[PDB]
Each structure stands twice: as C-alpha cells, then as structure tokens.
Write an enzyme that holds these catalytic residues in place. Structure first.
Site, short mmCIF file in Angstrom:
data_model
loop_
_atom_site.label_atom_id
_atom_site.label_comp_id
_atom_site.label_asym_id
_atom_site.label_seq_id
_atom_site.Cartn_x
_atom_site.Cartn_y
_atom_site.Cartn_z
N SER A 140 0.66 -1.22 0.06
CA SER A 140 0.00 0.06 0.00
C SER A 140 0.75 1.28 0.02
O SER A 140 1.80 1.35 0.58
CB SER A 140 -0.72 0.00 1.48
OG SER A 140 -1.64 1.29 1.34
N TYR A 154 -2.58 -0.75 10.36
CA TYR A 154 -2.70 -1.03 8.71
C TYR A 154 -1.38 -0.66 8.01
O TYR A 154 -0.74 -1.40 7.34
CB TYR A 154 -3.73 -0.33 8.09
CG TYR A 154 -4.21 -0.70 6.49
CD1 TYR A 154 -4.15 -1.92 6.27
CD2 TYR A 154 -3.55 0.39 5.70
CE1 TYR A 154 -4.57 -2.19 4.82
CE2 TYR A 154 -3.75 -0.07 4.45
CZ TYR A 154 -4.20 -1.24 3.86
OH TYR A 154 -4.38 -1.55 2.60
#
Lengths: 245, 218
Positions: A140, A154
């Site tokens: 990501s 995350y």
C-alpha cells in the site's frame, strides 16, 4: 502471450484487484492457481472468466490467516500445474482504529493476513519455484504516507513489506527470482468504491484526483511478472495517483 | 502499436539506453524526436534526430519547438541526458560540478517546462534518474548522487503541478547497465520500463521514483 507456458499463483484472486490480476495473467498465457477466502460462487465466476477465454485455472478455498492452509494451497497448485513461475500476494485486511482504541484481536488479524501470511506463502512458493521466477507483494501507499489517524496498524503491516522485499530479493537473487512490492493507492472496488465523501477526501490528496482501476493494478503486476522485468527487484513501486507525492 | 498517433520527445536518444528508448517508442507506433542547428530524418519516417547539447537551454527549447512543428503537441517526454564525473568532495573541480548541475538537473527542468507548454492532456513525463539517489556505497559520487536525488523532489512537485491535466511525471532509477541478481541490466530492459510508463496503462502512476537496479539499493 508473454507469459505462455508460465504458472502463476495468486493469493487472494477472487475479488477486485485479485480477480483482475488472475484474468490478466491468464490472458497473457499463464496457467493460474488462486486462493479465495469467502465465496465459492465468486471464485467460480473468476475461474470461468479465465476459461471462457481459453485459459487454465485452479481455484483453491484457503483462509489467508491460516499458515497451514496456505502451504497446502501452494502444494495443491504445484500438483496441478507443476512448479511455479510467479507468486502474487494479494490478501489483505483494511481496518480502522486509533492507537488507544484498536482491539488486540484486530491487530493480531491484520498481522496474520497482511504480514505473516505473505512470508508463509512466499516461502512455500519459493520452495516450488523455477529459477527466473517472480514474487510480487501487493502492499500500500500507506507504507509511505499516512495522512490521517486510525491507520497505524494497517500502515505498519504494509510498511513491513518494504524490508521483507529487500531481504527476500537478497535471498532469491542468486536464483534470478525477482521480488517486488507494488504499493497501490485507492482503487475502485466494491468494498472501497469511488463514491461518497471519504472517496472525495482521498482524491483531494492525489495528484490525479481519481481512484485507480483494478485493471491498472493488474497491468503493472503483469508487467512485473513478465520477461522484461528481470532487472526490477527489491523495489517498492508506487501506483497511487500521486497520493504519496 | 498502442502509441499509434502519439508524439514523443527523448532528450539523449543516440546510444545505449537513449537509443533503446527511441527504438521501443517508435516500434510501438510513436513519432519520436530525440536530441543527441542540425537534424536528420527519413522521408516518410517518423523519427527525427536533432543535434543539441543538453547543457544548452536555448538549444533544448528550440529542439522541442522543432519537434512540435513536425508532429504536433507532445504526448511523451523522456529526460535521458546524464553526465557522470567522479570526484571526492575535497577535489572535484567546479567546472565538473557545474557540468553535472547543468545537464543532470537544470536541463531536465528546462525540457520539462518547454514540453509541458506543448503537451496534450493525458501526457507522460519520464525522468531518468539513478539508483544512486537512494544508495551511494562508495566515495567519489557525491555530486553525481546529488544531481540524481534532485529528481525525486522534482518528480513529486511536477506531478502535483501537471496532475490536473492528467499528465503523469515519474522518475525511473536505473542501476548499472552490491547487486542482488548478479548481472548488469540491458538497455532494452530500461526501455521496456519507460515504454510501459509512457503507455495507456500507466495513467495512475505518478509522482513515483521507480527503481530498476538489479537490487543494488536493497
């Protein structure tokens, strides 16, 4: 067909980005095994998409939190198709909580799916991969830019893929296997759709002002899996609309 | 031929990686002008070679204008000029500092500005930087790495300026053409990565520094 004759394994190939990846690699000639965690209907559709177009496919139900399941899924793919050339790690869990609030169980779940199982699938695949192969993690852009609260764990689980990629590239380079980390921004999927005010806020942070499309991520992963990308290794490669500029 | 009908400008296109980039973009259907007033071309051809030193800004801005006269507004600019002089901090001559600043830094901006003034929305700007922006394992490379790390902030800020036009701006960082893979890169591998970025599948990649270095920087 730059991937003619090649065998790919996609962890998380049933929905969104992973479906687009599976279709993309089969369209270029590869036989594709993929895992799905939830819906045999949804996986059957992806598998049909590959075969109506003349491609070869194996769908495998496997929970990406369970390391034995992932090791078993890689061996079942190898029995089906032979040794692997390409591995794409696209499992993921995207889940919010401030540092003072997040539950211990939600932490341990993002660690198991987004970190641990990327290593476990990679080790079994490498055990059963040809020299000259490709391992592509789907990380990501939150490894590099975290503009808001609630993303700490995350972002931790995605920035872990940067050191894993460097180290794995050093381990597998002598076998001419490349290892890269693809870092997407927002992509229009059915659980993260380009619609609503959150999407409008993310777009404002992007240089391009629009979500990515599943097919754009698949096209980058197919390039990295292909025969022109054997010199790309160890890299964290952003495809994020300028989110992290 | 996904670049059929498109127009590319390559700064530094006459040998090695620059030649390979010209040949790949033309093979995909692009019109290509490149620098390496004098020019050569073929009748009926779509590759135009223009003599221009990359330290000379007025010659670069003219070359871009020449290319737009032949082919129309640009879709693609590739900045592949580069000078590499070794020298320690204490010893490097100021002339050599100024050569690397002019070629590797200043002319990258001058060509990007002229190309942005004559570029279609949806275009592509690709700088060719270096893995030494991220990893400098030995002495003698300080000003060279300084000139290549400059491209990282240039790419980010140019992506912000041109994003509203849907123009992407990226920085390709090659290694040699410390390694994880045990061979040098091939000119055609760098050209294949620039061609992907320059094509229609790559409109979501912008602002990035993208290493193609055999794992040199791992």
């Amino acid at each position: 067909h730059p991937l003619q004759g090649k065998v790919a394994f996609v962890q998380g190939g049933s929905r969104g980005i992973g479906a687009a990846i599976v279709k993309r690699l089969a369209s270029e000639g590869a036989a594709v095994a993929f895992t799905y965690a939830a819906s045999a209907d949804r996986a059957e559709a992806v598998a049909s998409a590959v075969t109506t177009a003349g491609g070869k496919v194996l769908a495998i139900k496997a929970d990406s939190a369970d390391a034995a399941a992932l090791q078993q899924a890689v061996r079942q793919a190898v029995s089906h198709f032979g040794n692997l050339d390409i591995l794409v790690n696209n499992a993921g869990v995207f889940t919010l909580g401030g540092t003072e609030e997040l539950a211990l169980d939600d932490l341990d779940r993002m660690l198991a799916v987004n970190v641990r199982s990327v290593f476990v699938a990679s080790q079994e695949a490498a055990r059963h991969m040809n020299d000259g192969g490709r391992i592509i993690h789907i990380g990501s852009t939150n490894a590099e830019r975290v503009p808001f609260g609630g993303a700490a764990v995350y972002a931790m689980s995605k920035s872990a893929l940067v050191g894993l990629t460097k180290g794995m590239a050093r381990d597998l380079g002598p076998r001419s296997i490349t290892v890269n980390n693809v870092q997407p921004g927002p992509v229009d999927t059915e659980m993260n759709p380009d619609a609503g005010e959150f999407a409008d806020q993310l777009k404002q942070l992007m240089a391009i002002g629009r979500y990515g499309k599943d097919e754009e991520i698949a096209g980058f992963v197919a390039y990295l899996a292909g025969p022109q990308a054997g010199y790309i290794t160890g890299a964290s490669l952003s495809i994020d609309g300028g989110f992290s500029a």
